[PDB]
Amino acid sequence: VYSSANNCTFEYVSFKNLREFVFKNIDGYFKIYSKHTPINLVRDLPQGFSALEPLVDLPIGINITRFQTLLALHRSYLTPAYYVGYLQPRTFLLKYNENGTITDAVD
Amino acid sequence: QVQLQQWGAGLLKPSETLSLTCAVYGGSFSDYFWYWIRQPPGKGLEWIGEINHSGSTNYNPSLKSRVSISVDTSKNQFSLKLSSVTAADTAVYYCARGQGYGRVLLWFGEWGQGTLVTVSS
Amino acid sequence: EVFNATRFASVYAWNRKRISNCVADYSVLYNSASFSTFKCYGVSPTKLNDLCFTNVYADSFVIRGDEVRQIAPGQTGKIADYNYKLPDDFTGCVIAWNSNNLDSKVGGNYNYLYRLFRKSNLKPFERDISTEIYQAGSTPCNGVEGFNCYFPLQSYGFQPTNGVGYQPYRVVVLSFELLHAPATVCGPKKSTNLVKNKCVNFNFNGLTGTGVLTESNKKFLPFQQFGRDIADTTDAVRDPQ
Amino acid sequence: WNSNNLDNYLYRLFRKSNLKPFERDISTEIYQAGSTPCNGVE
Amino acid sequence: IVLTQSPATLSLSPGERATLSCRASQSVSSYLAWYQQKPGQAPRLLIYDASNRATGIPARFSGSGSGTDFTLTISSLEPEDFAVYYCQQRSNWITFGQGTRLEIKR
Ligand SMILES: *[C@@H]1O[C@H](CO)[C@@H](O)[C@H](O)[C@H]1NC(C)=O
């Protein structure tokens, strides 16, 4: 519906729930960790500890400085329920259980 | 080696036709715009003929005359047949290998003499 | 697919093709016993089999075999200058076998041509295909053709009657460039066996070491590769295969 | 010193691996890059 | 247009800076050839296209000359340089030579 390709370099193809995704970008690698669960409490993510698992290692190697989300309905006009955070360099203290899993941490 | 056998001319009353089988000798001649020239006996040579490998079988614009050029791509040599001679044709005819600027009219045959006179010496 | 596959285009409109990451190995090829020429400027294929370029490109076209030499950095002529010019830094190799075999078209092989009469001198890697009636003299060309003016493309008429010098060879122009991002194809990657229970050296996906490899009852998440201990030492490896 | 007043010579192109300090290795082989063990004939 | 050369009959001695003028009026320095005829021999490819001297013919014929008055400059007249020169205007229907610029060895 909205796809205008030009001189393309390379491609790759592969209420009820929350969804989480980190989007770090170092060493020309837009690593994307992710995980998701349900939420009886529609309104907000309950203070529960979780730990995203590594999902991709795209070798895009591109200087990014800006993102934007994308949604839709049916017919609005081509003008002519979530919340993001922001990462910072920090030091953390993780705990691994028997199976090996980030149980909780100390910021 | 790279030579043009100026041949086919002869003694001539300055009214009939003649020929110049300027036979390409030692020439893989299917790539050039072979031209021709005309020297009044005792003067310099003025360009007349110009066949084209691309096509364009033509001549001196000042001498856009009945005399007709072609290359027998079979035998691969330029023709320049001296049709319906007049007095103004009185000279000597040659032929040459040309490219314009890549090269120019380079390889010349020996000489082709048009004896455009009834008289024999 | 981008090598041994059908016909191509005239070198004056020489084509381009981009190559991805997919590992690769020249040496799997190099000894293909077909490359009549593998004139290989960058490095020997037996050496660059592992050489990684952010970009690798293939060009391919039908030309009179001879033009092979003109496809050496440091060449001139109406084709090496008016149909393509390699750079004098062509990190690559001139692959070619022959066209006359599959390109004779006994009644005169056309389909391929060449801007014999091009204006400019080919800049290295110029893909330009702009046809034009250049001024063989100064008769204002602007289309004029027949004297001191002609168009650039002439006939690459290949025949079986005319000799191999005037017969075409299928010709490939290899060219690769490695910038600064994560590069693509990375040569080969060998594979030994899982020799176990005895003291051996090992190289598990770049993890090097020495020890005795046995079977463990451990299990971790499907994305982890190797396990460490409290003192930051490797003591578990998920066999990359 | 650069002496181009009299600047035959030759060296080598391909071989097994570099020698150890102060060794000589005159030779006339092929060190074929493909299996072809050309023996006397190129 | 007709060119013409300077020393029509240049009775120079060998080893001299022989040099033939070629004044035009249509200024086709984008060509301007220069050939030497031996009588009994069709003259070939001396000089052409600006100044590009086709070789075998020595570099003594230092080509030059632009605008309308062109000038080939033979370095040295020599025992093989007794012949008739032809600065060739081209690039139009006037692909013509000189008026038979003779240079006479002495
Ligand atoms: C850890 O592993 C055990 C057995 O494999 C399993 O029963 C348990 O659910 C896993 N997760 C834990 C203890 O958080």
Q: How far is the CA of A98 from the centre of ligand 1 (A)?
A: 7
Query: Residues enclosing ligand 1, CB less than 6 A?
Result: A 97-99
Q: For the stretch B42-71, what's the b/e string if a residue is b when 16 or more beta carbons lie within 10 angstroms of its beta carbon? A: eebbbbbbbbbbbeebebbeeeebebebeb
- Which residue out of B36, B51, B54 would a mutagenesis test of the C interface target, given it has the greatest number of C Cβ atoms within 10 Å? B54
> Using CB atoms, which residue from B58, B61, B100 is nearest to C136?
B100
Tell me the C-alpha distance between E57 and E35, whole Å: 10
Rounded to a whole number of angstroms, the distance between the first and last alpha carbons of chain E is 32
Half-sphere exposure of C75 (CA within 13 A, CB side): 22
Which is nearest to C171 in space by CA: C107, C229, C239, C86?
Answer: C86
Phi, psi of B110 (to 5 degrees): -65, -70
Closest residue CA from atom 4 of ligand 1: A99
Q: What is the resolution of this structure in A?
A: 3.7
Q: How far is the CA of A44 from the centre of ligand 1 (A)?
A: 28
Report which residue type is found at E75.
S
Q: Using what technique was this structure determined?
A: cryo-EM
DSSP-assigned letters across all residues of chain C: --SS-S--EEGGG----EE--S---HHHHHSSS--SEEEESSS-HHHHTT---SEEEEEEEEEEGGGGGGGSSS--STTTTTT----TT--SEEEE--SHHHH-TTTTB-S-EEETT-SSPPPTT--------B-SSSS--TT--SSS-B-SEEE--B-SSS-GGGSEEEEEEEEEE--SS--S------------SSEEEEEETTEEEEEE---------TT--EEE-TTS-EEEE----
A29 secondary structure, DSSP code: B
Tell me if E33 and B104 make a contact (CB, 8 A cut-off).
yes
Closest approach atom of ligand 1 to CA A98: 1
Distances (CA, A) of C44 to A5, C26, C224: 37, 9, 38
Q: How far is the CA of C158 from the centre of ligand 1 (A)?
A: 75
> Using CB atoms, which residue from E40, E42, E49 is nearest to B109?
E42
Helix (H, G, I), strand (E, B) or coil at A95: strand
And the tokens for A57?
Answer: 């290692």
Is the CB of residue C125 less than 8 Å from the CB of residue C58? no
Tell me if A27 and C220 make a contact (CB, 8 A cut-off).
no
Tell me the C-alpha distance between C52 and C123, whole Å: 26
A54 secondary structure, DSSP code: E
Contact B73/C at CB under 8 A: no
| Residue found under tokens 């800076």 | E17
Tell me the C-alpha distance between D8 and C234, whole Å: 58
